[PDB]
Design a protein around this motif. Structure first.
Motif, mmCIF file in Angstrom:
data_model
loop_
_atom_site.group_PDB
_atom_site.id
_atom_site.type_symbol
_atom_site.label_atom_id
_atom_site.label_comp_id
_atom_site.label_asym_id
_atom_site.label_seq_id
_atom_site.Cartn_x
_atom_site.Cartn_y
_atom_site.Cartn_z
ATOM 1 N N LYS A 1 -9.093 0.884 -4.636
ATOM 2 C CA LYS A 1 -7.751 0.823 -4.091
ATOM 3 C C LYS A 1 -7.511 -0.580 -3.592
ATOM 4 O O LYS A 1 -6.472 -1.187 -3.840
ATOM 5 C CB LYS A 1 -7.559 1.840 -2.968
ATOM 6 C CG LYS A 1 -7.433 3.289 -3.433
ATOM 7 C CD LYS A 1 -7.733 4.267 -2.302
ATOM 8 C CE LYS A 1 -6.736 5.437 -2.235
ATOM 9 N NZ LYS A 1 -6.887 6.358 -3.378
ATOM 10 N N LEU A 2 -8.516 -1.119 -2.934
ATOM 11 C CA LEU A 2 -8.367 -2.381 -2.267
ATOM 12 C C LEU A 2 -8.241 -3.488 -3.286
ATOM 13 O O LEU A 2 -7.462 -4.418 -3.114
ATOM 14 C CB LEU A 2 -9.563 -2.601 -1.368
ATOM 15 C CG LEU A 2 -9.425 -3.535 -0.207
ATOM 16 C CD1 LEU A 2 -8.286 -3.068 0.686
ATOM 17 C CD2 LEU A 2 -10.791 -3.473 0.508
ATOM 18 N N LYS A 3 -9.011 -3.378 -4.360
ATOM 19 C CA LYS A 3 -8.946 -4.349 -5.441
ATOM 20 C C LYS A 3 -7.521 -4.433 -6.024
ATOM 21 O O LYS A 3 -6.974 -5.522 -6.231
ATOM 22 C CB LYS A 3 -9.939 -3.982 -6.543
ATOM 23 C CG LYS A 3 -9.881 -4.920 -7.767
ATOM 24 C CD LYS A 3 -10.877 -4.484 -8.851
ATOM 25 C CE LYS A 3 -10.455 -4.957 -10.254
ATOM 26 N NZ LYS A 3 -10.635 -6.433 -10.427
ATOM 27 N N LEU A 4 -6.919 -3.275 -6.258
ATOM 28 C CA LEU A 4 -5.577 -3.215 -6.815
ATOM 29 C C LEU A 4 -4.528 -3.617 -5.793
ATOM 30 O O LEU A 4 -3.526 -4.252 -6.157
ATOM 31 C CB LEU A 4 -5.266 -1.805 -7.344
ATOM 32 C CG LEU A 4 -3.887 -1.696 -8.016
ATOM 33 C CD1 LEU A 4 -3.801 -2.613 -9.244
ATOM 34 C CD2 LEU A 4 -3.554 -0.244 -8.366
ATOM 35 N N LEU A 5 -4.741 -3.244 -4.519
ATOM 36 C CA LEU A 5 -3.812 -3.627 -3.453
ATOM 37 C C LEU A 5 -3.645 -5.145 -3.395
ATOM 38 O O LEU A 5 -2.545 -5.667 -3.347
ATOM 39 C CB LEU A 5 -4.303 -3.100 -2.092
ATOM 40 C CG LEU A 5 -3.466 -3.400 -0.842
ATOM 41 C CD1 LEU A 5 -1.985 -2.984 -1.024
ATOM 42 C CD2 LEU A 5 -4.091 -2.752 0.480
ATOM 43 N N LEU A 6 -4.755 -5.860 -3.380
ATOM 44 C CA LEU A 6 -4.659 -7.294 -3.263
ATOM 45 C C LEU A 6 -4.076 -7.933 -4.522
ATOM 46 O O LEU A 6 -3.476 -8.990 -4.425
ATOM 47 C CB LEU A 6 -6.034 -7.903 -2.965
ATOM 48 C CG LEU A 6 -6.440 -8.092 -1.502
ATOM 49 C CD1 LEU A 6 -6.294 -6.771 -0.708
ATOM 50 C CD2 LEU A 6 -7.869 -8.642 -1.463
ATOM 51 N N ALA B 1 0.845 -1.192 0.000
ATOM 52 C CA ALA B 1 0.000 0.000 0.000
ATOM 53 C C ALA B 1 0.880 1.242 0.000
ATOM 54 O O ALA B 1 0.555 2.240 -0.637
ATOM 55 C CB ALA B 1 -0.955 -0.003 1.199
ATOM 56 N N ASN B 2 2.008 1.191 0.698
ATOM 57 C CA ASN B 2 2.974 2.306 0.588
ATOM 58 C C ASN B 2 3.490 2.569 -0.828
ATOM 59 O O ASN B 2 3.599 3.735 -1.265
ATOM 60 C CB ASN B 2 4.170 2.059 1.526
ATOM 61 C CG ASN B 2 3.849 2.432 2.974
ATOM 62 O OD1 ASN B 2 2.992 3.280 3.218
ATOM 63 N ND2 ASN B 2 4.540 1.802 3.932
ATOM 64 N N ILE B 3 3.807 1.495 -1.554
ATOM 65 C CA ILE B 3 4.241 1.638 -2.939
ATOM 66 C C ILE B 3 3.143 2.214 -3.829
ATOM 67 O O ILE B 3 3.357 3.200 -4.552
ATOM 68 C CB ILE B 3 4.708 0.286 -3.499
ATOM 69 C CG1 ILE B 3 6.033 -0.121 -2.814
ATOM 70 C CG2 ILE B 3 4.835 0.359 -5.058
ATOM 71 C CD1 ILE B 3 6.463 -1.551 -3.094
ATOM 72 N N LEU B 4 1.961 1.610 -3.787
ATOM 73 C CA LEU B 4 0.849 2.053 -4.639
ATOM 74 C C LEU B 4 0.460 3.531 -4.403
ATOM 75 O O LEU B 4 0.215 4.271 -5.360
ATOM 76 C CB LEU B 4 -0.372 1.140 -4.419
ATOM 77 C CG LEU B 4 -0.186 -0.288 -4.915
ATOM 78 C CD1 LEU B 4 -1.388 -1.103 -4.579
ATOM 79 C CD2 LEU B 4 0.106 -0.300 -6.471
ATOM 80 N N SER B 5 0.430 3.974 -3.148
ATOM 81 C CA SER B 5 0.076 5.379 -2.875
ATOM 82 C C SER B 5 1.224 6.338 -3.154
ATOM 83 O O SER B 5 1.071 7.273 -3.926
ATOM 84 C CB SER B 5 -0.426 5.569 -1.412
ATOM 85 O OG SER B 5 0.515 5.075 -0.480
ATOM 86 N N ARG B 6 2.379 6.116 -2.547
ATOM 87 C CA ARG B 6 3.450 7.105 -2.663
ATOM 88 C C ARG B 6 4.188 7.158 -3.996
ATOM 89 O O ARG B 6 4.770 8.174 -4.295
ATOM 90 C CB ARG B 6 4.481 6.880 -1.574
ATOM 91 C CG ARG B 6 3.886 6.937 -0.185
ATOM 92 C CD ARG B 6 4.944 6.633 0.843
ATOM 93 N NE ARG B 6 4.332 6.494 2.151
ATOM 94 C CZ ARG B 6 4.185 7.498 3.006
ATOM 95 N NH1 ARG B 6 4.654 8.712 2.685
ATOM 96 N NH2 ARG B 6 3.579 7.277 4.177
ATOM 97 N N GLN C 1 -3.076 7.007 -8.254
ATOM 98 C CA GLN C 1 -3.375 8.246 -8.968
ATOM 99 C C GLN C 1 -3.294 8.085 -10.488
ATOM 100 O O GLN C 1 -4.239 8.411 -11.205
ATOM 101 C CB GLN C 1 -2.426 9.347 -8.499
ATOM 102 C CG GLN C 1 -2.801 10.754 -8.950
ATOM 103 C CD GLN C 1 -2.004 11.829 -8.213
ATOM 104 O OE1 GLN C 1 -0.943 12.258 -8.675
ATOM 105 N NE2 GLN C 1 -2.510 12.261 -7.054
ATOM 106 N N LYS C 2 -2.177 7.546 -10.956
ATOM 107 C CA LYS C 2 -1.966 7.271 -12.376
ATOM 108 C C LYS C 2 -3.090 6.457 -13.031
ATOM 109 O O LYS C 2 -3.484 6.749 -14.154
ATOM 110 C CB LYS C 2 -0.627 6.542 -12.564
ATOM 111 C CG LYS C 2 -0.464 5.849 -13.892
ATOM 112 C CD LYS C 2 0.646 4.796 -13.822
ATOM 113 C CE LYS C 2 1.960 5.387 -13.310
ATOM 114 N NZ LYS C 2 2.919 4.343 -12.830
#
Ligand SMILES: [Mg+2]
Length: 228
Positions: free
Chosen positions: A71-76, A51-56, A61-62
């Motif tokens: 977000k959760l769908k992509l996180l998993l 989650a740190n990688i995906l957000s920061r 955003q992209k």
């Protein structure tokens, strides 16, 4: 007598940890730096790292991923992709054996010490089975293997401890050979003396800190008990 509980990856074998995350991050359009890895991923739970990688690094955003369910769908997906890459690079042989750890392991074995292999990874046993030490596998050097039979370090360590005691009731002292800060905590939680192998992280919470095996003796153990 003495029981030693061994973590696997980072101790008996080295695999590329940062690399799996880098490759997953690359295939989502971003670059994972070592600096970022150290600060937001390394030593943290897998989903927190992800989650740190995906957000920061701007990947949410992209891709237009705005709501929590998106977000959760992509996180998993992302966290599963990273596991799939760990698997594939294991399938490709991307590891080195730490023979100096195997050295100390064999030393403890000849002095009557009992040794359990206790990794949370589904792959530890397979790899241990295929690595050769004299006329057997590294796997068959252990008195006991509980690897992959639970999914946290503390649960696998606990299981290894219970089984060492069942098999050998006259074991009174337990050690944990560990390479990661979380494992050191897991070791303490099950009442073992923690042998902190610092190859990369510093392991200040560990009862005994060292940088190379052979810097360990059976006598170090007795000494640790010690007052222990
Ligand atoms: Mg370890």
């Amino acid at each position: 007598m003495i029981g030693i509980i061994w973590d696997f990856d980072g101790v008996l074998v080295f695999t590329p940890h940062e690399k799996a995350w880098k490759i997953a991050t690359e295939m989502y359009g971003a670059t994972l730096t070592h600096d970022f890895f150290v600060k937001y991923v390394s030593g943290r739970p897998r989903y927190e790292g992800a989650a740190n990688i995906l957000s920061r690094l701007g990947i949410y955003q992209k891709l237009g991923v705005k709501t929590e369910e998106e977000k959760l769908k992509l996180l998993l997906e992302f966290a599963e992709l990273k596991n799939r890459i760990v698997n594939e690079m294991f399938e490709r042989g991307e590891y080195e054996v730490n023979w100096e750890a195997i050295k100390f392991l064999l030393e403890t074995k000849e002095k009557g010490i009992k040794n359990a292999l206790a990794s949370a990874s589904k792959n530890a046993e397979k790899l241990a089975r295929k690595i050769k030490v004299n006329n057997k596998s590294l796997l068959e050097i252990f008195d006991l293997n509980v690897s992959g039979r639970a999914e946290t370090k503390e649960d696998v360590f606990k299981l290894a401890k219970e089984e060492l005691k069942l098999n050998f009731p006259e074991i009174k002292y337990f050690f944990v050979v560990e390479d990661a800060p979380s494992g050191i905590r897991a070791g303490k939680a099950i009442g073992a003396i923690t042998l902190g192998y610092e190859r990369e992280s510093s392991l200040e919470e560990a009862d005994f800190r060292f940088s190379s095996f052979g810097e360990l003796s059976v006598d170090t153990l007795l000494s640790l008990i010690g007052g222990g």
